[PDB]
Structures are given as structure tokens and as C-alpha cells.
Amino acid sequence: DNSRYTHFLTQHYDAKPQGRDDRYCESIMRRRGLTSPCKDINTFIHGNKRSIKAICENKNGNPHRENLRISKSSFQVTTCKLHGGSPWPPCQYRATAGFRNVVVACENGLPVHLDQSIFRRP
Structure with a gap:
């Protein structure tokens, strides 16, 4: 199924955010x-x-x-x-x-995993 794809979108896709500040993160993460x-x-x-x-x-x-x-x-x-x-x-x-390219894992033609290591920084 495309449950992992839709799940990928839930954790990693946000079409048009307004502010991408701390508050945005806290709000969207919830x-x-x-x-x-x-x-x-x-x-x-x-x-x-x-x-x-x-x-x-x-x-x-x-x-x-x-x-x-x-x-x-x-x-x-x-x-x-x-x-x-x-x-x-x-x-x-x-x-x-x-702003850069991203690393994902694909399955059945759809992104189902985002490799965070490339954005990983303490």
C-alpha cells in the first residue's frame, strides 16, 4: 500500500508554510x-x-x-x-x-523515507 508514502508526506511534506521559525516547528510537529x-x-x-x-x-x-x-x-x-x-x-x-537536494528511499515509485543525516546537526 501507499501508507508509507502518505506517512512520508505526513512527517516530511508541507506545501506552503508561512513562517519557518521556531514556532512553526513546534506547531507543525504537534x-x-x-x-x-x-x-x-x-x-x-x-x-x-x-x-x-x-x-x-x-x-x-x-x-x-x-x-x-x-x-x-x-x-x-x-x-x-x-x-x-x-x-x-x-x-x-x-x-x-x-535549500538543497534531498535524500530519500523510494518504494513502488513513491518516497517512503527521508534520510535526516544530511540535515543532521546538533
């Missing part, structure tokens, strides 16, 4: 059910969805490491880094906006 427990780091990709799906085709992706895919095009993104100890609510986050 709405996307990533606050129980608080996910430590999570990145959202912005833009048109067709571009992200495209990462699994040749027109916007290259093989990467072992069974991963890295996009040819760059995407606006916002990485939300947990700040504070507790893995439980309230979850406090620091946002960092960025």
Missing part, C-alpha cells in the same frame, strides 16, 4: 503527531509534491549510497531540532530553513 514522544530531529520539504515524487524517477534523482535516492533539484526545507531534554510534551524546537 499537528503531524510527532510530539509523543518528541521526535528529536525532523525535516519538512516545501514546494510542489510532484517534484518530490519525481525523485524516484530519472528526471529528478540519482542512486545514493546503498539503496537511497538523492534529488537533482533543490528544495526549500525546514529542519526542526528538539531543544530541551524530555522526550515528552511540551516539545521545544529550533528551526533552521534551508
Whole structure:
């Protein structure tokens, strides 16, 4: 099924955010059910969805490491880094906006995993 794809979209896709500041992270991390427990780091990709799906085709992706895919095009993104100890609510986050290509895992032609290591920074 496409449950992992729709799940990928739930944790990593946000078409048109308004502000990509700390408050945006705290608000969207709650709405996307990533606050129980608080996910430590999570990145959202912005833009048109067709571009992200495209990462699994040749027109916007290259093989990467072992069974991963890295996009040819760059995407606006916002990485939300947990700040504070507790893995439980309230979850406090620091946002960092960025613009670069992304690394995903594809399945049945659809993105089903986002490799956070490329945005990973304490």
C-alpha cells in the first residue's frame, strides 16, 4: 500500500508554510503527531509534491549510497531540532530553513523515507 508514502508526506511534506521559525516547528510537529514522544530531529520539504515524487524517477534523482535516492533539484526545507531534554510534551524546537537536494528511499515509485543525516546537526 501507499501508507508509507502518505506517512512520508505526513512527517516530511508541507506545501506552503508561512513562517519557518521556531514556532512553526513546534506547531507543525504537534499537528503531524510527532510530539509523543518528541521526535528529536525532523525535516519538512516545501514546494510542489510532484517534484518530490519525481525523485524516484530519472528526471529528478540519482542512486545514493546503498539503496537511497538523492534529488537533482533543490528544495526549500525546514529542519526542526528538539531543544530541551524530555522526550515528552511540551516539545521545544529550533528551526533552521534551508535549500538543497534531498535524500530519500523510494518504494513502488513513491518516497517512503527521508534520510535526516544530511540535515543532521546538533
